[PDB]
């Protein structure tokens, strides 16, 4: 589960704290969890684990983490979003949270998949989840009711 970022005086919330994006040259480590855009049946963002990165090809190897075993994908860095490594504390670094109505990618409850959603409510207290409205064409107005997603599993779209 993710630690709260606790910065000292004059420290910016860092890359991968809450909504602060990774640096443009960033490379994730083996074992890091990421959102990975893979071909589906269509394309789909999935929860995945980094196996390696090659600087020669700018491609990761990632494993889809499923309860029956893992399936390997090889992906450009452009299809891999590192998850946050710290929660932003709403009480100290509120500006590092996604705000109401922002478009994000969020892990759908009880899945290992990410989908487009709008922020319904950011966390108000350090232990809180986001509340989001997932895009869902099964409903007339096209949105789920508010569903909880932890800071770990909400990334920029």
Curated annotation (Swiss-Prot):
Disulfide bond residue pairs: none
Presence of keyword Lipid biosynthesis: no
Spans annotated as Histone H3K4me3 binding: 134-136
Site feature location: Histone H3K4me3 binding: 108, 115
Variant or mutagenesis effect after changing residue 152 to A: Does not strongly affect binding to H3K4me
Subcellular location: Nucleus
Effect of residue 136 to A/F/Y/W: Strongly reduced binding to H3K4me3
GO cellular component: ATAC complex; mitotic spindle; nucleoplasm; SAGA complex; SAGA-type complex
Keyword annotations of the record: Acetylation, Chromatin regulator, Coiled coil, Nucleus, Transcription, Transcription regulation
Transmembrane segments: none
GO MF terms, alphabetically ordered: histone H3K36me3 reader activity; histone H3K4me3 reader activity; methylated histone binding
Family statement drawn from the similarity comment of this UniProt entry: Belongs to the SGF29 family.
Domain remark from Swiss-Prot or TrEMBL: The SGF29 C-terminal (also named tudor-like) domain mediates binding to methylated 'Lys-4' of histone H3 (H3K4me), with a preference for trimethylated form (H3K4me3).
Protein name: SAGA-associated factor 29
């Amino acid at each position: 589960t993710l630690p709260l970022w606790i910065g000292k005086p004059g420290d910016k919330p860092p890359p991968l704290c809450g909504a602060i994006p990774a640096s443009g040259d960033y490379v994730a480590r083996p074992g890091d969890k990421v959102a990975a855009r893979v071909k589906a049946v269509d394309e789909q963002w999935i929860l995945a684990e980094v196996v390696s990165y090659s600087h020669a090809t700018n491609k990761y190897e990632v494993d889809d983490i499923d309860e029956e075993g893992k399936e390997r994908h090889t992906l450009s860095r452009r299809r891999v979003i590192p998850l946050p490594q710290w929660k932003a504390n709403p009480e100290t670094d509120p500006e590092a949270l996604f705000q109401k109505e922002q478009l994000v990618l969020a892990l759908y409850p009880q899945t290992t998949c990410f989908y487009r959603a709008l922020i319904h409510a950011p966390p108000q207290r350090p232990q809180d989840d986001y509340s989001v409205l997932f895009e869902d064409t099964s409903y007339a107005d096209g949105y789920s009711p508010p569903l909880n997603v932890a800071q770990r599993y909400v990334v920029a779209c």
